[PDB]
Every structure is written in C-alpha cells, then in structure tokens.
Scaffold this active site. Structure first.
Site, mmCIF file in Angstrom:
data_model
loop_
_atom_site.group_PDB
_atom_site.id
_atom_site.type_symbol
_atom_site.label_atom_id
_atom_site.label_comp_id
_atom_site.label_asym_id
_atom_site.label_seq_id
_atom_site.Cartn_x
_atom_site.Cartn_y
_atom_site.Cartn_z
ATOM 1 N N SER A 1 11.914 6.417 -16.697
ATOM 2 C CA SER A 1 12.948 6.540 -17.565
ATOM 3 C C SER A 1 13.095 8.345 -17.761
ATOM 4 C CB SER A 1 12.632 6.325 -19.050
ATOM 5 O OG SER A 1 13.809 6.802 -19.753
ATOM 6 N N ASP B 1 12.659 40.157 -27.161
ATOM 7 C CA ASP B 1 11.619 39.689 -26.200
ATOM 8 C C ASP B 1 11.888 37.982 -26.164
ATOM 9 O OD1 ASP B 1 10.048 42.077 -26.105
ATOM 10 O OD2 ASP B 1 8.643 41.463 -27.537
ATOM 11 N N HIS C 1 9.311 28.348 -10.518
ATOM 12 C CA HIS C 1 10.714 27.830 -11.520
ATOM 13 C C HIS C 1 10.707 26.433 -11.577
ATOM 14 C CE1 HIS C 1 14.334 28.571 -13.809
ATOM 15 N NE2 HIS C 1 14.090 29.857 -13.827
#
Ligand SMILES: *[C@@H]1O[C@H](CO)[C@@H](O[C@@H]2O[C@H](CO)[C@@H](O[C@@H]3O[C@H](CO)[C@@H](O)[C@H](O[C@H]4O[C@H](CO)[C@@H](O)[C@H](O)[C@@H]4O)[C@@H]3O)[C@H](O)[C@H]2NC(C)=O)[C@H](O)[C@H]1NC(C)=O
Ligand SMILES: CC[C@@H](C)[C@H](NC(=O)c1ccc(F)cc1)C(=O)N[C@@H](COP(=O)(O)N[C@@H](CCC(=O)O)C(=O)O)C(=O)O
Ligand SMILES: *[C@@H]1O[C@H](CO)[C@@H](O[C@@H]2O[C@H](CO)[C@@H](O)[C@H](O)[C@H]2NC(C)=O)[C@H](O)[C@H]1NC(C)=O
Ligand SMILES: *[C@@H]1O[C@H](CO)[C@@H](O[C@@H]2O[C@H](CO)[C@@H](O)[C@H](O)[C@H]2NC(C)=O)[C@H](O)[C@H]1NC(C)=O
Ligand SMILES: *[C@@H]1O[C@H](CO)[C@@H](O[C@@H]2O[C@H](CO)[C@@H](O)[C@H](O)[C@H]2NC(C)=O)[C@H](O)[C@H]1NC(C)=O
Ligand SMILES: *[C@@H]1O[C@H](CO)[C@@H](O)[C@H](O)[C@H]1NC(C)=O
Ligand SMILES: *[C@@H]1O[C@H](CO)[C@@H](O)[C@H](O)[C@H]1NC(C)=O
Ligand SMILES: *[C@@H]1O[C@H](CO)[C@@H](O)[C@H](O)[C@H]1NC(C)=O
Ligand SMILES: [Ca+2]
Ligand SMILES: [Cl-]
Ligand SMILES: [Zn+2]
Ligand SMILES: [Zn+2]
Length: 691
Positions: A571, A607, A630
C-alpha cells in the site's frame, strides 16, 4: 542605494568576456602547475575585489593521467599480431594552438592498465536497457568481449559499470555524429560541430557521492589514512578509452554477427551498426587490442574559498561555487561559468567598498578536480560538514554558463521555484524578438512547463556537478541556471575536446556575451536574494506540490504489478497520507510566516525554512549508497546526470518482475515506502509550531 538593482547593474558583459579570455589561454588540468597558478591568481583578484578573506584549501586526492612516454591507443590486429590500424595519439590542435604545450591527450580518467585483445560487441549507448536488449532479447553474450559504445544519453561512468557487469573485458567509447554533429553546421574551426578527429575526455568512476576514492567520509588532509587501491571507491575493473568518429568508423565498419535490432541503434556513420560479436567472414580472425598505460596518482588540488562576512547573520552561509579545473582549455566547461563567478565577486566587492554588506555571509568557491569526480567540492564539504549542515542556507552552482543560445535552463530544489520565477520576471530577456520583455516571458514561451500553462520548465537536480555533496549528502537547498539549446530541433558537440576554446564561445555561441550576462544576473540575483532577504526566499508549499506529483508517479510504476500488490499487501496509503499532511502543515506555516518586529520568531522561522531541505536527509543513506542521503532526490542509479524522485522506492521497483524471490523484492518495496512516508511526515513536522 545598495539594493539588488545596484548589484545587477554593476555586472558587465565585457568583463565576463575579458575574464573568459584570461582563463582559457592554456590548459588548467587538475593537479597541474598551471591550475595551481590560476588558483593563486583568482585568490589575489578576489582579495583586490574586496572580499574579507580568501584562502586556498588543498587536499591530496587520487587523480589519473596518461603516461607521457607510453601513449594509450587501440589497434585492429591480424592473426600474426600485426597492428594494421591504430587509433590517433592526439587531437589535431586548433588554429593558433598547434604549439601549446601540456594538452593532455584523450583518455578515460581512472582506467586501469591493460592490453586486452578480443572480439568487439557494439552495445549502442551502453545503457541498462541496451544491455537488457542484447542479453535478454538478442541472446548476445558480452563476457570476455571488448565492448564499443557511443557516448550520449547517460553519464559515461554508468556505461562502464554496465559493461563491466555484463562481463566485458574492455570498453571503447566514441562520439557518433548522430549525437555530436548537428546537420547543416560546420566542424570546428568553421562551426561548432565536432570534427572526426575530436575526442571527448572524461572520468569513468562510479563514486556514488564518495569524493576522493581513497578517503570516503573524511577530508584528504595531511594526516589522512588512505584506503589501499584495491579497496578504493568507484574505480573501474576493465580498461577504457575514448576515440573520435574517424577512428570509430574504422573499428565498426568490419562488424559482423547480428544486425542492429532496430533504428534506435543506428548512428550516422556509413556502417551497418552490426552488434557482433566480431567481424564479418573475411576479417573474422582479426581482433581489437587496447593498450592502456595511464596511472592513478595521489596529487595535490586547491580550492579557492572567498568570504564576504554577513552584517546581521554572519553564521548563515549562502554559497556560490563552481569548478576551475578543465580537461584542456575549458572554453565552455568550466570557464564560461568561472568568468561569471569572477564578475559576480567583482560586483559584490564594489558594493562592499561603498560600505555595504549582505545580511548573511556569502561564500564564493573555485573548486578543483571537479572533472575527476567532484573531488574538490566533496573534500571541502567533508572537512566542513558540521558548519555546513548547521549554517548552510543554500548552494548555487556556477559551472558552464552556456551550452546553447536559445533559452534559460534551471534545475533546483522546489524551495527555490518561487524565487526563480520572481527574479526572472524582473530581468530583461536577452533573446531576439523579446526585446523589452522579461526573461520570465521568453523563458516561459520557449520552455513551457509540461504541467502548468504560463509557467516555465524547471527540472530536478541530478548529479555530475559540484552541488552533489551539498544537496544529496548534506541536504542544503541547491540550484543552478544556464543558457541552453532548443532540444526539439537538435549537450554541445565540442564538450571535453581540445576544440572547446575561447574562440568557440566568442565566434559561435555568444559574441556579445549577453547570454553570459543574463546567466550572471540569474545566479548573482539568486545569491543576492538568499543572502539579503529578511525572510529566506523559500516557499515550502512548492515542495508539497511536487511531493504529490512524485507520489502519483511512483504509485503508477507500482500499479503496473496489481497482482503482486494484492499478494504482498503493498500500500502507498502512508506515503499519500504523509504528503497530504505536508501540504496542510506547509499551508499553515506559510500563513504564520506572513502573519508574524520579532527577530527570534523570524529567525526561528528562518531556521525552519533552512532546515526543511535538511529534513529530507536520512542518516542511514540509500541502499548501498551511503553518501546519497536525500530521500526525495538521488542521482539515477542508471545515469548519474539525471535526478530520480523517491529513489529508494524507484530502485526497489526497477525490473522487479525479474527478481527470483518476489516476496523478498516486494518486502523491500514496502520497506522503502515506509522510509519515504516517515521522512515526508518528519519533514512536515519541522514546519509545525515548535512547542
Ligand atoms: C497524517 O496526520 C494525521 C493526524 O492528523 C496522522 O493521524 C494519526 O494516524 C495514526 C495512524 O493511523 C493514528 O493512530 C491511531 O491512534 C489511536 C490512538 O489515538 C490508536 O488507538 C490506533 O490504534 C488502533 O487501531 C489501529 C488501526 O485499526 C490498530 O492497528 C491498532 O492495533 C489499534 O487497535 C492508532 O494507532 C493517530 O491517532 C492519528 N493521529 C491523530 C488523528 O492526531 C497520520 O498518522 C499522519 N500520517 C503519517 C504518514 O504520519
Ligand atoms: C555535455 C554538455 C554539458 C553542458 C553537460 N551534459 C549533459 O547535460 C549531458 C547529459 C547526458 C549525457 F549523456 C551527456 C551530457 C553537463 O552539463 N554535464 C554535467 C557534467 O558536467 P561536467 O563535465 O562538469 N562534470 C564531469 C564530472 C561529473 C562527475 O564525476 O560526477 C563529467 O560529467 O565528466 C553538468 O553540467 O552537470
Ligand atoms: C590573466 O590576468 C591576470 C591578472 O590581471 C594576469 O596576471 C598578471 O600579470 C601581470 C603581467 O604579467 C603581473 O604583473 C601581475 O602580477 C599578474 N597578476 C596577478 C596574477 O594577480 C595574467 O597575465 C593574465 N593571463 C593571461 C593569459 O592573459
Ligand atoms: C601501430 O603502432 C604499432 C606500435 O608503434 C606499430 O607496430 C610496431 O612497428 C615497429 C616498427 O615497424 C616495430 O618495431 C614494433 O615491433 C611494432 N610494435 C608492435 C607492438 O607491434 C604498427 O606498425 C602501427 N600500425 C600502423 C598501421 O601504423
Ligand atoms: C514572489 O512574489 C510574490 C508576489 O509578490 C510573493 O507573494 C506575495 O508575498 C507578499 C509578501 O508576503 C504577500 O503579502 C502577498 O500576498 C503574496 N502574493 C501572492 C502569493 O500572490 C512571493 O512571496 C514571492 N516569493 C518569494 C519571495 O520567494
Ligand atoms: C611510463 O612508461 C614506461 C612504462 O613501463 C615506464 O618507463 C615509466 O615508468 C612509466 N611511468 C609511469 C608508470 O608512471
Ligand atoms: C556467457 O559467457 C561465458 C562463457 O565463457 C559463460 O560462463 C556465461 O555463463 C555466459 N552467460 C550466458 C547468459 O550465456
Ligand atoms: C545561436 O543562435 C542562432 C539563432 O537561432 C542559431 O541558428 C545558432 O545555431 C546558435 N548558435 C549555437 C552555438 O547554438
Ligand atoms: Ca574524502
Ligand atoms: Cl551549473
Ligand atoms: Zn564542468
Ligand atoms: Zn566537464
């Protein structure tokens, strides 16, 4: 007034032209004395331009060079062992450079030594799908064969890995006129096309973001402990060499065995493009022999690092970086970018001399050894990783400013999309027929977005350049911009050849240096806004939009296997849930950002903006690629130059119908969906109210 307009107006095309000429008269190969002298020149000029500090940061890294007294070449050899044809030892030098010394002859950097002798197999672009076609469909076995591949489509390092995994014993790369000769344009020096004697240099590593092959994780400083060569990262196991199409024709013309499977395998030479193996009947006993004697050598390299200290937030860094080392003269790659950086530093320094300082610190970098695997930028980022991940706002790359004269090309994080749209609406188009119009208008007309009318195309970041360590390893918002060609009537033919010179650019690409100037305004304007805007110019909502697009895309790849998704209960619900949540939280954060005199709330909010790209980093990295961390973007496993979205799920799904244990393969798809949903939700949560 000291504002962005003052900065931009100070930039001059004529200065860029002067710098390009200055940087391209002799070769600046990484690790050579000439490139160290240029580093010292740039350091000195950036100091006179007004930067607060300008230092060299040096490392000792593994480089690769031909043997000057034992040249690399390829032969056709007859049954007696007579070499009846030899490839060229050098490219004929262009007019007026026939006496320039220290032009490195064409070679594939980091090839091992060897003299393998064998039958040729022609493997098209040596892509993953090309090897699938040979092995699966055509039943052609590359084991123990010398493979010949045309450059183009994918990074050459991926071609070599693919050939190596297919069992090849050597690889010959060549430039086919189908991919490097535009119909109706003349060869250099009379046009911008590749001559038959022209050859593309370039490294063939598979570093996966590691940097110096001998010191993955840590800077190659004076006391570094180096891996032995046998444990080095990313070196190829088989000899490789590149040739031009005059020589390629002589190797291909005799090829026998199977016909090419279809027209996508045929280039433009007058040969049949037979796949092989080996030559037709009459020549069946001739073989091809490579002779490679290049050596890998640890060599000193030098980055120049300039600092313009911020007035208000000196501990926030906006970095403008691009490389300085070149294969030969670097007329486009990289000096058309380095001349632009030089003028940008000059302009910022003019403002500084009048009493101005940016709000945040700007770092300027002239990277070394980019051409040998992004070595300079990666070692420096390894050294400074703690400063960069706690203080790095953004990285703007600055390699080749032009590869055509048609329109703008931008690749960046979604966090910069709004910045780039807004900036280009304020810049003048340099294009014919758009005088008095904005760059946004010309760019949008010539390169429309595939999904949104009235917006321009902006691409993902792939890799193959110096932003890789900042974006894919450290998670610092990154972008790049350059002028490009029109793909649909047709990167540049003379790439990495001795013919890529100042004259190429001045005569055929940008005689008035107006495309260079436009690129300087885009890169420099981006840096100005990032270093000066009170609120960082990132729009988190643009990430929410793309995340949904990538989630739809990866779901649609998986849905080609409906039976397996039922069987293994695969899923994507959690991923879509995370994306929906990111969208909702980003929208709420945007409302607060506009609705919040409080420098603590602002910087707290700045920030949150700065660490948002940071939140997509997974400290465990992607599978078997620990330096690609990443979770949204990685360089494609099949082509380092291209970006892939949700790479962990993409690679788990790739060719999954071929895996012998589907339960295990689909389990790993589910694991990667969990990692991606979790990371998206965690990133979203960095934008929630902080307490
Ligand atoms: C997107 O954000 C939403 C919040 O708006 C967030 O919703 C959360 O979903 C989780 C997982 O579905 C919810 O977890 C439930 O929490 C209750 C306690 O509050 C538990 O009792 C539930 O467990 C029972 O039911 C399960 C499912 O049938 C059984 O497996 C289990 O054995 C128990 O019987 C369950 O853990 C959580 O309450 C909400 N939080 C809210 C609404 O605030 C959603 O998770 C976010 N998406 C992602 C990807 O993070
Ligand atoms: C060839 C025209 C260039 C403008 C070029 N190429 C491509 O866009 C491209 C895409 C597919 C392909 F097969 C070949 C080139 C381009 O921009 N290439 C990359 C590579 O640039 P560089 O030559 O500086 N980088 C080096 C080293 C890369 C690495 O080691 O990771 C290289 O690719 O050999 C880039 O700029 O990011
Ligand atoms: C590129 O420009 C630089 C800087 O102007 C030139 O280097 C200077 O050369 C002069 C004359 O020889 C010296 O007196 C200066 O000290 C140099 N300045 C430096 C290094 O900062 C260089 O000659 C130019 N190169 C070419 C090929 O034109
Ligand atoms: C290709 O290059 C090779 C190497 O230079 C040439 O073969 C050599 O020829 C010399 C002089 O005749 C001999 O003494 C060497 O023994 C040969 N070396 C090898 C490795 O075979 C060859 O003649 C060249 N072929 C062509 C067509 O130019
Ligand atoms: C790009 O420009 C647009 C248009 O000015 C900016 O969006 C506006 O931002 C201001 C200042 O907060 C708001 O008051 C307006 O409501 C916004 N207009 C819109 C969304 O249509 C946008 O912020 C700029 N993007 C940057 C600076 O990254
Ligand atoms: C280059 O050419 C020959 C090959 O053995 C030798 O005299 C010299 O050592 C070589 N240089 C190297 C291997 O660095
Ligand atoms: C290809 O070549 C070698 C024969 O030397 C063999 O060991 C290898 O298994 C072959 N593979 C296939 C798929 O035919
Ligand atoms: C520069 O632009 C003109 C006009 O479109 C074009 O014909 C020419 O091919 C371009 N030069 C290069 C190097 O792309
Ligand atoms: Ca290192
Ligand atoms: Cl770039
Ligand atoms: Zn480059
Ligand atoms: Zn290059």
């Amino acid at each position: 007034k000291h504002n962005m307009k003052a900065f931009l107006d100070e930039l001059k095309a004529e200065n860029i032209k002067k710098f390009l000429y200055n940087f391209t008269q002799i070769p600046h190969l990484a690790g050579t004395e000439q490139n160290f002298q240029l580093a010292k020149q740039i350091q000195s000029q950036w100091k006179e331009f007004g930067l607060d500090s300008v230092e060299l940061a040096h490392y000792d890294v593994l480089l690769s060079y031909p043997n000057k007294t034992h040249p690399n070449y390829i032969s056709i050899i007859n049954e007696d062992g007579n070499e009846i044809f030899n490839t060229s030892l050098f490219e004929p030098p262009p007019p007026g450079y026939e006496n320039v010394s220290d032009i490195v002859p064409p070679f594939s950097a980091f090839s091992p030594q060897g003299m393998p002798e064998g039958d040729l197999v022609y493997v098209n672009y040596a892509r993953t799908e090309d090897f699938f076609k040979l092995e699966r469909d055509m039943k052609i076995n590359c084991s123990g064969k010398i493979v010949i591949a045309r450059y183009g489509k994918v990074f050459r390092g991926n071609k070599v890995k693919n050939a190596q995994l297919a069992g090849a014993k050597g690889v010959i790369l060549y430039s086919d006129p189908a991919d490097y000769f535009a119909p109706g344009v003349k060869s250099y020096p009379d046009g911008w096309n590749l001559p038959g004697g022209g050859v593309q240099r370039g490294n063939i590593l598979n570093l996966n973001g590691a940097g110096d092959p001998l010191t993955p994780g840590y800077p190659a400083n004076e006391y570094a402990y180096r891996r032995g060569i046998a444990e080095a990262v990313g070196l190829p196991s088989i000899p490789v060499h590149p040739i031009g199409y005059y020589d390629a024709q002589k190797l291909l013309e005799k090829m026998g065995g199977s016909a090419p499977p279809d027209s996508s395998w045929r280039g433009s030479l007058k040969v049949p493009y037979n796949v092989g193996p080996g030559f037709t009947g009459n020549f069946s006993t001739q073989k091809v022999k490579m002779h490679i004697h290049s050596t890998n050598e640890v060599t000193r390299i030098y980055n120049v690092i300039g600092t313009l200290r911020g007035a208000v937030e000196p501990d926030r860094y906006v970095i403008l970086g691009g490389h300085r080392d070149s294969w030969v003269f670097g007329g486009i790659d990289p000096q058309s970018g380095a001349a632009v950086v030089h003028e940008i530093v000059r302009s910022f320094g003019t403002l500084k001399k009048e009493g101005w300082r940016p709000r945040r610190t700007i770092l300027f970098a002239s990277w070394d050894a980019e051409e040998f695997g992004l070595l300079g930028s990666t070692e420096w980022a390894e050294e400074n990783s703690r400063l960069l991940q706690e203080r790095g706002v953004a990285y703007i790359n600055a390699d080749s400013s032009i590869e055509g004269n048609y329109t703008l090309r931008v690749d960046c994080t979604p966090l910069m999309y709004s910045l780039v749209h807004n900036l280009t609406k304020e810049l003048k188009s340099p294009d014919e027929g758009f005088e008095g119009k904005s760059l946004y208008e010309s760019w949008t007309k010539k390169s429309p977005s595939p999904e949104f009318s009235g917006m321009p195309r902006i691409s993902k970041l792939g890799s193959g350049n110096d932003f890789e360590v900042f974006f894919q390893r450290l998670g610092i918002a990154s972008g790049r911009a350059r002028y490009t060609k029109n793909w649909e009537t047709n990167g540049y033919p003379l790439y990495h050849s001795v013919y890529e010179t100042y004259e190429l650019v001045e005569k055929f690409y940008d005689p008035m240096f107006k495309y260079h100037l436009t690129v300087a305004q885009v890169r420099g304007g981006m840096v100005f806004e990032l270093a000066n805007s009170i609120v960082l110019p990132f729009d988190c909502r643009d990430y929410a939009v793309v995340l949904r697009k990538y989630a739809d895309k990866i779901y649609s790849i998986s849905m080609k296997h409906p039976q397996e998704m039922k069987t293994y209960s695969v899923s994507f619900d959690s991923l879509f849930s995370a994306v929906k949540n990111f969208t909702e939280i980003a929208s709420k954060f945007s409302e607060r950002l506009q609705d919040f005199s409080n420098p603590i709330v602002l910087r707290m909010m700045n920030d949150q903006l700065m660490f948002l790209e940071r939140a997509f980093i997974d400290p465990l990295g992607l599978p078997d690629r620990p330096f690609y961390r990443h979770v949204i973007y990685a360089p494609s496993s099949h082509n380092k130059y291209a970006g892939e979205s949700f790479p962990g799920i993409y690679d788990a799904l790739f060719d999954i119908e071929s895996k012998v244990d589907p339960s295990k393969a689909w389990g790993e798809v589910k694991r990667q969906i969990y990692v991606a949903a979790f990371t998206v939700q965690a990133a979203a949560e960095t934008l929630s109210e902080v307490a």
